[PDB]
Design an enzyme around this catalytic site. Structure first.
Site, PDB file in Angstrom:
ATOM      1  CE1 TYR A 112      -3.947   2.160   0.517  1.00  0.00           C
ATOM      2  CE2 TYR A 112      -2.470   3.433   1.906  1.00  0.00           C
ATOM      3  CZ  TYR A 112      -3.651   3.317   1.210  1.00  0.00           C
ATOM      4  OH  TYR A 112      -4.558   4.362   1.179  1.00  0.00           O
ATOM      5  CD1 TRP A 114      -1.571   7.755  -0.655  1.00  0.00           C
ATOM      6  CD2 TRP A 114      -1.482   9.445  -2.105  1.00  0.00           C
ATOM      7  NE1 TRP A 114      -2.847   8.262  -0.787  1.00  0.00           N
ATOM      8  CE2 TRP A 114      -2.814   9.308  -1.665  1.00  0.00           C
ATOM      9  CE3 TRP A 114      -1.168  10.447  -3.031  1.00  0.00           C
ATOM     10  CZ2 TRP A 114      -3.838  10.128  -2.124  1.00  0.00           C
ATOM     11  CZ3 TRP A 114      -2.190  11.266  -3.465  1.00  0.00           C
ATOM     12  CH2 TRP A 114      -3.507  11.100  -3.026  1.00  0.00           C
TER      13      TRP A 114
END
Ligand SMILES: NC1=NC(=O)C2=N[C@H]3C(S)=C(SO)[C@@H](COP(=O)(O)OP(=O)(O)OC[C@H]4O[C@@H](n5cnc6c(=O)[nH]c(N)nc65)[C@H](O)[C@@H]4O)O[C@H]3NC2=N1
Ligand code: PGD
Ligand code: 4MO
Length: 773
Positions: A112, A114
């Protein structure tokens, strides 16, 4: 050495770089950006800061003992520099060993994070592309942002709702009379985008102010959103918004003001919720006075807000912090229930919206084509694509292999993972209950990380490989997650630094050692991939009547922008309101479900079949609460999560070198704390140091410590060691919102604060490990 200017983009916006003798020396905002982010300077600095990762490294213990290494010393910085050929051989052999010994269930590839924008250099998709060729992997589902809301919304309104286009900003300017920001700070959070941001919320907010619309902000903190509008500011004790909404609803029923026709024709189950609201089922009428006792907000204020919302065209714009908490599913479910009672869903300027604070939601969409990128081997939000676990259950999985867990009405088993490969993410900052996580990570034989900054995650790896930034390569990306304003050429600015390599090149080399080279590359190089994505968009644009230049002409200009046709008139839910039989919602009944028979059937004690007030694990002034202050562990103003912490921007907010902690004057005075003091913040789960800034911006009983600080443990081998810098997830609990969504509860946090009088401490997180220099 090169001299000149180059245009590119990032999660913070479009910019032009000045290059002098092969070094980038300044990033200037795009002339068309309506509101550039002040973080741009830090983006440039991140290319060259002291924590930039120079070379591939292997943890000494891992190098020497492999699976027999002492895993309790991960993070102490004892690394050995190796050659790329050595590193790549080792990563490929470990991926293959784990796949053969344990199967695809042994490799966790959720990774996970950004990352950076870009259709080709998409590090997490490239990771899954390689792991697919290696035999498979365990993936993660959902995200840390709307983990609860994204699962309850489909049962209530039929779709995800949080990542969908909102009623356009211009429609709000001409029609809305009352604008409510509920647990949302759009001025702070609109600075960034998943794809390149167009910063479309800023003009929209300015238009509301010029029109003189009444703005109300419901938030424990006096934010810049409050300050920009001079808004009426309501300050609820954190985690009590559902009680306030119930008091509003009770007022609307008691005074017989609610919209009975809207309820009758567009909703289902209001008659099963009514008895709960009136206290027939539990002997507790959910009045404004009852809500005041829990939330601290005056009963009369609750009643007046309820009446005002019913008599004026009101837009309830809600943010996501209030569902990033225990029982988080109830917050937006109750908000939609309140909105239904008001009866304005589907009217221009009325109803609710869950994405006005994120990535330009509400900015008018263009008629341009969608851009696609590299795949993992195969249409909505890209991160939403026993092989899958809810993302925040990663440590529960490690601690309980083979155990069962509930999720949205089904039962599954945790896989038995032995290796984790993380790229473009920082779980040693983003995940909750750091001390639990630190111990749980000892279950992994091998932990491989790619990053370009020495984050706490890279410091804890067995194998660390230095990735390049976007500014050292070429790519292509969309401008505007919802608006689709245009397509940008993300041009190379400088040559790769030190021995850094793109994640694409790293994975291609690992795939080659697995015997699967051509399968990974497809025989294409960087520019061949980029042209194929552009060419596909142009073909799609041609069919729709949007003219687009040939690839080399597009690259020479650097950007293509698309026209807005009817996007400025978009009104969410208008077709449903106009004709609900012809245009039903995607729910079992076709209507808004206030009571869900589907959820009733699941029989979950922590997620009832209608919006319900339940006591959370811990809350400010809760019965028997051990700690006195709630920590608003929200998103940083001057970082993108952890990104940019190791840059020059840190000088502007650090207090005596530590992450800042905002504290009310009365709470500071009671502890003998002065502005600028170093303080120890602690609870039963951990202890950290922060630097205090005394302000009445935070309500009494609440302290603000943003998420994203780089965890800097005093001694990794000492259980519960003090964090010297200020990572707020050292204090949070790692539990699911409920059995329905299993979302994270990163903002359900209480703690105590005292002036720090212990031995002086040296910060080590913002310089590279000695051996990596
Ligand atoms: N207590 C908490 N409260 C919260 O509110 C909270 N927020 C959540 C949320 S909401 C999110 S995001 O839906 C996560 C964010 O964690 P993430 O690991 O994405 O954080 P970043 O600091 O953005 O880490 C990105 C990481 O990636 C590196 N990187 C960038 N580009 C590249 C690349 O091209 N190649 C590689 N190999 N690496 C790249 C960056 O340098 C950076 O280190 O937080 C939750 N936690 C919360 N807790
Ligand atoms: N500058 C910036 N930095 C980022 O890191 C960043 N992250 C992006 C991401 S990935 C997302 S998911 C979003 C997050 O968007 P999200 O709405 O989750 O933002 P937060 O900063 O966690 O909280 C917003 C407001 O909620 C308030 N709040 C907290 N608890 C409560 C409560 O109990 N009740 C009420 N009424 N209010 C409360 C906080 O004080 C804060 O002002 O921002 C996105 N935009 C971002 N911008
Ligand atoms: Mo998020």
């Amino acid at each position: 050495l090169a001299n000149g200017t180059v245009m590119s983009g990032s999660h913070w916006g479009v910019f032009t770089a000045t290059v002098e003798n092969g070094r980038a020396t300044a990033f200037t905002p795009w002339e068309k950006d309506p509101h550039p982010s002040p973080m741009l300077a830090g983006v440039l600095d991140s290319i060259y800061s002291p924590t930039r990762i120079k070379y591939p490294m292997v943890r000494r213990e891992f190098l020497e003992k492999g699976v027999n290494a002492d895993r309790s010393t991960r993070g102490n910085g004892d690394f050995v520099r190796v050659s790329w050929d050595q590193a790549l051989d080792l990563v490929a052999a470990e991926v293959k060993r784990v796949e053969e010994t344990y199967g695809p269930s042994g490799v966790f590839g959720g990774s996970y994070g950004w990352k950076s924008p870009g259709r080709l250099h998409n590090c997490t998709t490239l990771l899954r592309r390689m792991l697919t060729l290696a035999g498979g992997y365990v993936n993660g589902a959902g995200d840390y942002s709307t983990g609860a809301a994204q699962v309850i919304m489909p049962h209530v309104v039929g779709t995800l709702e949080v990542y969908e286009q909102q009623t356009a900003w211009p429609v709000l300017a001409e029609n809305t009379e009352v604008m409510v920001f509920w647990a949302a700070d759009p001025i702070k959070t609109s600075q960034i985008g998943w794809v390149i941001p167009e910063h479309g919320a800023y003009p929209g907010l300015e238009a509301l102010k010029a029109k003189g619309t009444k703005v109300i902000v419901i938030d424990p903190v006096r934010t810049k959103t409050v300050e920009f509008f001079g808004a009426e500011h309501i300050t609820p004790k954190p985690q009590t918004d559902v009680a306030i909404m119930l008091g509003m609803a009770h007022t609307l029923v008691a005074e017989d003001l609610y919209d009975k026709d809207f309820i009758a024709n567009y909703t289902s189950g209001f008659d099963k919720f009514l008895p709960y609201l009136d206290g027939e089922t539990d002997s507790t009428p959910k009045t404004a006075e009852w809500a005041e006792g829990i939330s601290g907000v005056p009963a009369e204020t609750i009643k007046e807000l309820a009446r005002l919302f019913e008599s004026k065209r009101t837009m309830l714009a809600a943010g996501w912090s209030m569902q990033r908490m225990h029982h988080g599913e109830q917050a937006h479910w109750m908000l939609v229930t309140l909105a239904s009672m008001l009866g304005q869903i589907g009217l221009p300027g009325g109803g609710f919206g869950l994405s006005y604070h994120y990535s330009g939601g509400g900015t008018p969409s263009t008629s341009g084509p969608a851009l696609a990128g590299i795949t993992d081997g195969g249409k909505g939000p890209e991160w939403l694509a026993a092989s899958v676990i809810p993302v925040a259950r990663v440590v529960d999985m490690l601690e309980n292999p083979g155990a069962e867990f509930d999720f949205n009405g089904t039962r599954s088993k945790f896989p038995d993972v032995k290796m984790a490969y993380w790229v473009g993410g920082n779980p040693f900052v983003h995940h909750q209950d750091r001390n639990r996580m630190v111990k749980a990570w000892e279950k992994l034989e091998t932990f491989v990380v790619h990053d370009f900054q020495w984050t706490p995650t890279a410091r804890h790896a067995d194998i660390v490989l230095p990735a390049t930034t976007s500014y050292e390569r070429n790519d292509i990306e969309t401008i505007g997650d919802y608006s689709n304003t245009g397509i940008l050429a993300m041009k190379k600015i400088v040559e790769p630094l030190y021995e850094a390599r793109s994640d694409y090149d790293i994975f291609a080399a690992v795939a080659e050692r697995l015997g699967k080279g051509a399968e990974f590359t497809e025989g294409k190089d960087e520019m061949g991939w980029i042209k194929s994505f552009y060419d596909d968009a142009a073909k799609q644009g041609k069919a729709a009547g949007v003219q687009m230049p040939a690839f080399d002409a597009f690259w020479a200009e650097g950007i293509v922008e698309f026209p807005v046709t009817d996007g400025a008139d978009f009104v969410r839910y208008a077709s449903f309101r106009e004709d609900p039989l012809l245009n039903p919602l995607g729910t079992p009944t076709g209507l808004i479900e206030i009571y869900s028979k589907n959820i009733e059937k699941m029989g979950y004690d922590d997620c009832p079949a209608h919006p319900t007030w339940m006591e959370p694990l811990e809350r400010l002034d809760g019965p028997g609460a051990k700690y006195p202050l709630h920590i608003a562990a929200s998103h940083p103003f001057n970082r993108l999560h952890s990104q940019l912490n190791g840059t020059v921007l840190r000088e502007g907010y650090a207090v005596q070198g530590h992450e800042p902690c905002l504290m009310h004057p009365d709470d500071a005075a009671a502890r003998g704390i002065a502005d600028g003091d170093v303080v120890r913040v602690h609870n039963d789960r951990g202890q950290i140091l922060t630097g205090v800034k005394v302000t009445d911006a935070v309500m009494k009983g609440v302290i603000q410590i943003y998420e994203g600080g780089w965890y800097d443990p005093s001694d990794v081998t000492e259980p519960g060691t003090l964090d010297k810098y200020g990572d707020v997830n050292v204090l949070s609990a790692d539990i699911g919102t409920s059995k329905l969504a299993q979302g994270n509860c990163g903002q359900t946090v209480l703690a105590e604060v005292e002036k720090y009088t212990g031995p002086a401490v040296t910060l080590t997180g913002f310089v590279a490990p000695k051996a990596a220099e």
